[PDB]
Amino acid sequence: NTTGGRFVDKDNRKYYVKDDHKAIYWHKIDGKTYYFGDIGEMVVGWQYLEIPGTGYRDNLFDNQPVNEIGLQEKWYYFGQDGALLEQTDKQVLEAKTSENTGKVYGEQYPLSAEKRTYYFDNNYAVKTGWIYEDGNWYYLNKLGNFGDDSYNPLPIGEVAKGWTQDFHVTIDIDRSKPAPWYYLDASGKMLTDWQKVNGKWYYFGSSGSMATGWKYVRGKWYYLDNKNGDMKTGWQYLGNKWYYLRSSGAMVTGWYQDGLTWYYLNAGNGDMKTGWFQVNGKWYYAYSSGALAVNTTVDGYSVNYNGEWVQ
């Protein structure tokens, strides 16, 4: 909706001038959208800019006041003639790197030899977050990189690979909300169910989120590290009780013999018994270590070869 002006080439830069003033920021001119930055230099290619449409960075000229405003920034792609690529689905484009972004018309810069598929939201900005394609989920980075006083927005919108946390984000991470972990394979596909990664097992279920703590899967109980998620095996002291997990990871219930030593894991909960207890009417005694007392005396009580209290 910006008319009455004209594009002007000067000092190896391109401007749009009307009534003798330079256009700045976002402008819709003759069916196309352009962006002129803070001083009027038309941009081209990959750009990380404040979102258009509010009016605070729109239809402005360098002779007008520029309001202070807090607008999130997103990635946008402009043609070599400066027109905004109004894609709302996806498109194959030169990968964005530390050398082909933030450039303006007139500048010299290489055209990425590598091209990637980029997804877009309904407002022409590069899409971030989860996307479902051809039977699989992929995660497009919501955040860029940091590093003690430093922020690189380049990763935003790129296909995530490997271990990835899904933070709730707008302009900054939202620490109040949960941030589950996921694992994307070499091609970015989200893994589900059991998966062996770096030598350890993890359970991602059907949603993809990495489970932590006790987890019931296909009839058996498993215990994933409460913080890191890796599946535990063997004897585990959890919540002040002992549990025995098979090498497969499944929790054991009932009688279990380790070498010559018998142990009794509670029928339902699975916690190890100590002291006197009875199974199917018969009484047995387990020491504090959980080991069953056999062929000996326990406080004036005889227990035979099977640990049974012999009357």
Ligand X SMILES: CN1[C@@H]2CC[C@H]1C[C@@H](OC(=O)[C@H](CO)c1ccccc1)C2
Ligand Y SMILES: C[N+](C)(C)CCO
Neighbours of 117 (CB within 10 A): 10
Binding residue for ligand X (CB under 6 A) from 82, 249, 270, 307? 249
Q: Which is nearer to ligand X, 86 or 107 (CB)?
A: 107
Per rule CB under 6 A, is residue 38 in the interface with ligand X? no
Residues 6+ apart with CB under 8 A from 68: none
Q: Which does 276 bind (CB under 5 to 8 A by kind): ligand X, ligand Y, none?
A: ligand Y
From the CB of 200, what's the least distance to ligand Y, in Å?
8
Q: Rounded CA gap, 232 and 224, in Å? A: 6
Using CB under 6 A as the binding rule, whether residue 255 contacts ligand Y is answered as: yes
Rounded to the nearest whole angstrom, what is the least distance from the CB of residue 40 to ligand X in the complex? Answer: 9
Element (H, E) at 254: strand 254-258
The per-residue b/e assignment along 172-198, b for 16 or more CB within 10 angstroms, e otherwise, is eeeeeeeeebbbbeeebbbbbeeeebe
Query: Tokens 């055209």 appear where?
Result: 111
Q: Which does 130 bind (CB under 5 to 8 A by kind): ligand Y, ligand X, none?
A: ligand Y
Nearer to ligand X, 124 or 201 (CB): 201
Say how many CA atoms lie within 13 Å of 217 toward its Cβ.
Answer: 21
Burial, 9: exposed, middle or buried (Cβ in 10 Å; 0-12, 13-18, 19+)?
A: exposed
**CB closer to ligand X out of 157 and 249:** 249
Cβ closer to ligand Y: 249 or 290? 290
Check residue 201 for interaction with ligand X (CB under 6 A): yes
Asked if residue 11 binds ligand X (CB under 6 A), the reply is yes
Binding residue for ligand Y (CB under 6 A) from 269, 296, 302, 304?
269
Q: How far is the CB of 292 from ligand X (least distance, A)?
A: 28
